[PDB]
Each structure stands twice: as C-alpha cells, then as structure tokens.
Amino acid sequence: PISPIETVPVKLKPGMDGPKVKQWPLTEEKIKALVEICTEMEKEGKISKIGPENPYNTPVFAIKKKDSTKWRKLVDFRELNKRTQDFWEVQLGIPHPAGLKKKKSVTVLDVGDAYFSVPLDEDFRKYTAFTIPSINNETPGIRYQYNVLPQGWKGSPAIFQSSMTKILEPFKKQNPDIVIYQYMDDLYVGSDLEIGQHRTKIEELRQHLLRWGLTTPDKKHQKEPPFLWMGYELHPDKWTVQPIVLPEKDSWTVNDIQKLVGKLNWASQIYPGIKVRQLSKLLRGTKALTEVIPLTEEAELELAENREILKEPVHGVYYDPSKDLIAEIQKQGQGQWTYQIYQEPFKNLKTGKYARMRGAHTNDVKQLTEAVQKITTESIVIWGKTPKFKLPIQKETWETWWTEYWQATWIPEWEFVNTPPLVKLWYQLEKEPIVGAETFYVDGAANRETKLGKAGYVTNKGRQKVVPLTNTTNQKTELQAIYLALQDSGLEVNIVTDSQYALGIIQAQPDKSESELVNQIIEQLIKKEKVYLAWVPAHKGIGGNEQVDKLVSAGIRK
Amino acid sequence: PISPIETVPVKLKPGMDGPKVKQWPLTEEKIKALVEICTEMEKEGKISKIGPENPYNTPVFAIKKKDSTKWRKLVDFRELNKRTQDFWEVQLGIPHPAGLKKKKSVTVLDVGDAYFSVPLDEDFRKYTAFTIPSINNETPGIRYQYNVLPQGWKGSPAIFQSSMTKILEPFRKQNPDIVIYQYMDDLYVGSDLEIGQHRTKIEELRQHLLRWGLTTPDKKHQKEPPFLWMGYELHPDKWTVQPIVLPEKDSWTVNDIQKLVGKLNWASQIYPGIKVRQLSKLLRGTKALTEVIPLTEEAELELAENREILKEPVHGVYYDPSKDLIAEIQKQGQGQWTYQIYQEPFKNLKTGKYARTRGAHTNDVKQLTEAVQKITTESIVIWGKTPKFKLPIQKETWETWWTEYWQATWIPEWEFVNTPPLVKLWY
C-alpha cells in the first residue's frame, strides 16, 4: 500500500526549476507497455494523472533487463537530479564486519518495494513529471506525477532511510536488543534467539512493518545464511570474502593487471599474506590501459606466491566488547608492511597491510610508527578504541628516535614482540666532530646540459680524489661524492658537504631505497664505527670546500 | 520556556554555501559523553534533532574543561565562522583594546553559558548542523541542529555583545582601570593591581556577573602538585623575544666557527645588514674540524658587531590588518619548544619558546598541543586574532590525539608540515 509516515520537505537548488525535458517517443510497442504498467501503478495510488497545470516533466523509457519475464520501467531523473537540493548522504561510511558481535541467529528481510510506499513531499510531487505519448503523432498527453519516492530521484535513497529508522523506532522500543541494520533495500534483523524463538520475533517485526505499509514479500525470515554483503561473506559466527578468483594468461594489458592488483587488495582484508608490491609497481606509467603490460620474473613470482595463499580459504571472526583488542605487526618485504588485529589469542579479527609509498628514503622506524597510526585510525572507525600493539622493535630503540625527530608522535601501550626482522636504526651519525679523525671535504657538480658530472674530495692531508661522471645531475654526483668519501675513509670519519640534499637524505637515517647509489652510502655507513656528516653554505667561502668545488669543476663549468 | 526575544538576522557571506566538514571518527568513550550532553541539551531545548533535509555538518568533540572534571562539548565552527563570521566581523566586529597587552596580569573567564540564552534566527539554524558519529558506521549519526547561540560560532558573542556591554557597565564604572576584552566567549580581563588585589577584582567581577545576568563562570584553582597560577593568570608585560644567544666559543675549533657561519648565514634574511666574510676567512682553509683557531682582528670585529646586532631588532613590525598572521612551531629539544608568528616570510611580529619539562606531560603531542594553546591565547591578547599554525606533526596523528589534551574553547586554523625544518637550531 503506502506508508503513513511523516513526509520530508525537499526543494531545488535556488535559481533552478522543474526539468523541462520532453520525452522522445519510442515505438508504440513499449508505449503500451508503459500504459499497462503506470495504470496499475496508479491504481495502487503511487501516481495521480495531471497533464496541464504541471509544465515540468522528464523522459519516460521502458525496456527489458537481466533474465526477467515481465517488462521494466527506466525513468532516471538525472536532469532533475541536477536541479534538486543536496541531502544528508544516506551512508557516508562503510560498515566493517569486524566491528560486529556474533549473533546466535540472523536473517535478511527484502524490502524491495521500499521507496514506492514512502510518500513524497506534497509540493515536490510536481517536479517529478513524465510524458506518455501515443501513435502516429496523435497524443493529447498523458502526463503523470509520483506520490512516493521516485525510482531514480536523488532524494529517494535518503528520505527512505530516514523514514525507515522512524518506522522501526517504536518496535525496538517494546522489544530491544535485536541488532537491526539497514542498507538501502536490505533489512538485516539479528539476535541470539533459537531458530524458532528468533523467528518468533521476526514475525512481530514483519507485521509491525506490515502496519507501516512495508509489505515484506518474504512469507518468512527466509534468506541464504551465507549472506553476500559488499564482498563480505557473512555468518552468525564468522566472515570472509571468496570471489577473489585470479585468472592468468599471456599478453595482459595495463588494465588487466590493475584489475588483478585491485582484486589482490580486497582479499588482504582477511587473508594475511597478500603482497601487491611488484604488481602495483608495474602499473607505474599510467597512460594506456589496452597496452599489454610485461611482467618480469619478479612480478610473476608475486602472482604465484599470493595465488596459493588465496587457495587457503581463511575464515574471519567477529568482535567481543569484553576482551582487550590487540594489534600485531610484522615487517615484511622491503617497503611493504602487514598487520593483524585480534581478540582471541589465535582468531583473526581483521587483517591489513600498510603499503609504504608516502616517500622514498624512509626510515624503517618511521614506517612502523606510520603503520601504527594507520592501524589506530582504522581501528577507531570500526571498533571504538585503540588496540594494544605487539611491535617488533626494541623499546629502548624507540626512545632514541622520538627524542630526536622534528615531528611529534604518539604510540599507545605497545610491548616488544620478537619476530623475524627487528626494527633497529642501522647506522647513526655522531653529534660532535671527531678529534683527530681525517676530515674529508667532498664536492660534486655537473653540467646539466651535458649530463657530465664530477666528484671528488680533499682530506686534511692533501689527499685529493676525482672521478668523471656521466648522465648525472648536480644532486646525484653530490651523493657520489660523499660516497667516494666513504669509500676511502676510516672507521671514524668526518665529511663536509656543500649539498643540502646530501644532508637531507643521509641524516634522514634511511635504510632502504630503490637507489643503488644511496644504498651504498648506507652500506659504507652500516660498516663504519663513527661518521660525522657536516654541512656548510656552498659558494660562500668555506674551509677546503671553497677550493674543493674548484678541483671538482676542473673543466667545464655549469 | 516562553521567554525568548527578537533575533538578529544572519546571512552567509555572498559566494559560499553552508559548510559540510566531514566528521572525524570518535572513540566510544567520548561518544557516550556527547550523546549524554546532547540529550540534556534536547531536554533543555538548546538543540533539536533534525532530519535528512539538511546536508550540513560541523565536527563535534568531547573535552574535560578541567583536570579530572566532567565532559564538555566542542563544535568546530572554524569553517562556518569563516563564511558567516568573516562577513559579520566587519559589522559587529568587537574592537580590540591594546591596553590589554600593556597591563600586568590578565585572567581568561569562560562566559560561554551566556550565549545559551539568545535564540538564533529560525532560518540560520540550518547551518549550525552538527552530526554525532556512531561506531562502525552502523548508524549514520544522530544529526543535530542548534537553537540558541552555539558556544563556537564567532557570530554569537557578537550578538550577545548587547547584553554583555550592559552587564559590564556597572562594574566598569566602579573599576575604571580594568580592561575587559571579549573574544569568542572568553572574558579577557586585564589590570595592573598587585596580584593579591587582582585575585580580588576578578572574583569580585565573578560575583558581579553571577548576580545580574546569572552568568555562571566555572570556578577554577589547583592546590595540588601541578599548582597553576590562581584564576589561570597571564602576564603580557612579562613577554619579549630575547632567547637568541650566539655561543661564547665561536673562535675555538674550526667546526665551531663553521657552525657560527651557519647561523649568521641564514640570519641574513631575518636581520639585513649582517656580514660574515671576515669570519669565513678564518675557516677558509682545508682543515680538521677539531683544530682550534682563535679569533682574528677583523673576524672579531664582525663577531662582536653581529653578536649584539642580534639583540635589537630592525623593521618588521608591519602589522597588516589584511594579511593573516601565520604561526609556525619547531620541535627543538626535550621539553623545549619554539615558535614564530610572522605575516610575511622572516618578518615576524613576535617569537617565543614554550617550556614544559619532558616527563610528567611527556607526551610530544601533549606539549605541542599545549604550546598550540599557549601560542594563541597571547596572540589573542596582542593582535586579537588567531594565527594559522604549522605543526611539525603527522596529519593523521594530530587529529587523533589533539582533543585528548585540549582544554580550549576555540580551535586555531592549522596545517601540517612534512619537511625537515632548517629552523631546527640552537634557538
């Protein structure tokens, strides 16, 4: 029938008006198909014929779709969707199963003629007009108007949700503690009552909804236990995903991989192991999708590795507001991180992976901390509190990093958990100049136009060194310099650069990087006992450096 | 009940529409405090639940006005104020008394309660929209509209000015030498009396308000180990930027002088007129860093010159009422904080150093957020407007822990830096 709910007042963006889009007449065939339909649709009271006094209207279309035997009606009000006001987005969030408590029993009540029963604002009813034509240019004009939430109209999704919650309020009042969650056209009643006892309440609800006009076509609380919701396979005790089938073959395009990469991402939710590093990186160079993307042994290896993990259908558990939440982290791969937050000492609640990409030349300790926060954030949203962290990193090591970082950070309660790799600042520069140790004055330049660079150094003993460099920009050689400096120094060394960049990186305490050059600066540093990196304004007259830059530019100038 | 009065028509500054700031996920604990608070505010008629016909939003938060006390609601009217208050600041803009900074002591009285009386334009209520979030997005949130003047909207205190300028009339009459500035529901009262007397003329005024307008000001004092000054006192007069000190060891080891040329170098933009050439000569030769090289005639002359030239500033005191003062903070040491409020690059109107021994309030985020509060409160006293902050903190991390140590009623505009600051020096 029609719900006797309190309507909701809607309007068009100030300055706009009722869409004035006449309908292009289709074949007289569907013209009738429209007649037979609207007729009963009007008989139900959902519509009322009004032709003249409403100038506005929209295009009315009718065709078949998705293996059905009865005609369909496609009246998408997009133009109207453009002139209509904005509403409070029905669902600005994504509910995560992990944040749900297990119920002894649950069901789904299809509320598919949902909108059609909720009456639209007494005024707006006008702006929802559509024109019904006839055959051979003969047609007086059967203009119609909706009395309920239009099939497409922008407000429908919203108004309906706001109207349902009202519909249900009294019910859950006389009979509480029965989790009810409503996604658009799906009602999920859940509780901890025996199959029968439970269904006893469902009826109470159904008839309640029968009172408010929402006739649940489902003669009973009948629905497929393995509920498919947003890729989530749900049950009164566990959750997971399954359609994550990954096909393989020769000549896969950039589009193919991107899709495959996207797939691997979703599964990670519950399957602890998915690594999209190499595959995600191959997508680099966004431009042509149909362009066949080549995978190198590495990329191929990835697919293989993940593929089997997926083979394992790991189940996911729910949450319990009596056991303290825990978050364990493992340092995997190079720039990829994985984590699992759990309640029971062995039952995965939710799993995720932090993909390090924010910046190149990042300290691992920083990475962990980032992942920590990333986890806190995602936790807050889903559950309601911050979890205790099981962290693979020496406590005393943390104390060193935080105290000496320009940024401020915060890590809740977190205890040490010895896993495969330990988070530890590999090397570390000194604070004051080493007494005695040989001082090296590095320097490097490069004619940008010729890509010809030059590196070298000068110790406090007249030990000079210079080596030609090609296809190198000013900065790169600057590093190569400090490199040379490291190559022929001692366990204790002092280096003086002119580069702001060289100091920006090294002092960043980097460890990993897709930069062989930078990597070897780390290699040399990881070996030495004491190293002192110092910076002085270039081209301002500084001990040695002044002159250094001279022997470096011992030829072409830049 | 039926005791309202005519309202003042408020209208969005031409151009913009209602705000729609996405609400940040709040923890369960705080949501409880919010739902409670809100319910009483509905039981009291201060705010009325609203429908979907309103696509507006202003973030809400939960904070404890005092250590170990109850919860306090806090709406983020930064956005709405920008559109709505930026128009109204030229119409009802409450003038700022410079006599406030010149005086000795200053107490900040919370007068928010007052605004809870004057009803707002039944038409403007729409914009004040504020959504309380629910966990896991189970519920799309208990949306709320405001009825009276919310304690966040910069346009509210403007309206309530009417009454306030009266309530104060008497008191001011008997106490002529006490300046009473009013910024965003914060009563900034200043004077020159001996603190002993100050503590009096303040409770006096606190007892006054409570008598005539039933303006109840949350009493505050801490007799504990963390004893804070009585009435939360400030001392504008005790404020000045002098911490910049060059080492007395500038002519010892080459390394030293090297650093010296480091500081003097950058200072070139802050203090036009400084030279370094002479001093550079001393460190010009390829040498070790630990080799001691004493001062030389010309180097010495220019060191002494710059050494002092740093104490007395030059021009820069150009306060452009148009350009918004930008505040920038720099994490220095263990408990030591430093900030600079400039308008144009290197042309600062003031610099300071927040000091909160690391240990008890060890939290970096606690000290930073603490500094964020302190850096502004004064800013209010001296320029009478909130600076734009640049905090050396992770975007996500800040938003997550800032409401936890926050005890303010207003929220300074902030943005997050993600680059190693060269400003991270001895100062």
Ligand SMILES: CC(=O)c1ccc(C)cc1N[C@H](C(N)=O)c1c(Br)cccc1Br
């Ligand atoms: C937020 C919520 O409770 C929920 C969200 C989405 C879906 C698809 C179902 C939801 N709850 C149900 C229910 N009927 O209560 C549920 C299922 Br399905 C499985 C386990 C527990 C719960 Br509470």
